[PDB]
Amino acid sequence: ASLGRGRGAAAAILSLGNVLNYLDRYTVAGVLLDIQQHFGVKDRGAGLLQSVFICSFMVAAPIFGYLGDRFNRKVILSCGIFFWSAVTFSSSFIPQQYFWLLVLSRGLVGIGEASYSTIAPTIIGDLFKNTRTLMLSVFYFAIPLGSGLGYITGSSVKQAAGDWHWALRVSPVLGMITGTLILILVPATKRGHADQLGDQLKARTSWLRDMKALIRNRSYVFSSLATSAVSFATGALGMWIPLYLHRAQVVQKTAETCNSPPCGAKDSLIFGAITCFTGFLGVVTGAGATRWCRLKTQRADPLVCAVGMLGSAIFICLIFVAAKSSIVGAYICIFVGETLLFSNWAITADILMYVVIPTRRATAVALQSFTSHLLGDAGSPYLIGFISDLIRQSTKDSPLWEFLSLGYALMLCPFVVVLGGMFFLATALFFVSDRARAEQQVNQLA
């Protein structure tokens, strides 16, 4: 029959788990300045944490997908929850003379994180058409809320407690509880995946050969490159914006220097507020623009993406010169650029599913993702830190020069955003032809 409360309890528990996952992910970028001051490292060391975390997630995701494909799922999910909760809790006890060890800790988290985002969504697909679409929408909309909460709790715990260590100790406790219910309240153990009807295999393919066709898809390649550029920009900005804002506030002499008060606390909370509102706002505006423009021409999605990218690049270029005088203009530019940047999220997946044939579709959702991390946020924070260090090395160490060097280094992101917009325009050039070829192939194969 139909399980009464299980299909709702599982969805709610997994949504809470995803929120906690992203909160754990961003709680270390929330308080980066305190880590920098305590461990005595420069910008390169600051970016190394996020770079290592993203690299570990990159490596770990396909292996955990493979493991969850055939082995048990709920035990793997609970083990991952417990593992990164324990690692995060233990990472707060490291002294100030073993900074490298802390970096290693992030890598371990980067493993456990990959055990969730690759396995948690598919369980939803087991349990639910319209209901499945609504659940999946809620599950994916849990992301910006999680990032915002990560920022707010990090900053607020740093302010109230007076020590950044606590910011890494209250997050995983909720994990220790959460996984427990995932082990006792998730209905069933493993269902579905019974596509091998008749015998033990019906359609195994060969992975590589179909991949050989994927390079021949110009629209798919260009869209993947544009997604990689977007990931680069988002990772760099999300890692480095709060520190930039704090330095801009300290050079202008609004508040005192760090460690006399609880340093920068309102900026991170405010930034969490904008990102929390902006995830939803950007998704809504992108969907509405696509819906309106679909009835006027067949190239609505990539042209809309390109226009949004150009606008986001313009506003991201504007904020850097606007932040010198006042901060309200900087926040307004953050808002506008945030919406214009995240307007493309759903449209990217829509065009991906709309171009490539269903049979290879799953493979694309893997490969692109890997590329979306390979040229994106794998080394973007490290690159920004390295450029900032190189600029500051040939100049005297002053707060104003620190802020100016960070701004000049961050100026790289709008160039990449413009490149992504150009790539989306290239996608729009060939989208119709690729769609026609895919339609002909899928119709004539039957």
Ligand SMILES: CCCCCCCCCCCCC/C=C/[C@@H](O)[C@@H](N)COP(=O)(O)O
């Ligand atoms: C201007 C300030 C910007 C600061 C924003 C940082 C806040 C982070 C919120 C978003 C959290 C990560 C979003 C994930 C993006 C990638 O996974 C997708 N674009 C790639 O997957 P695919 O495209 O294939 O679906």
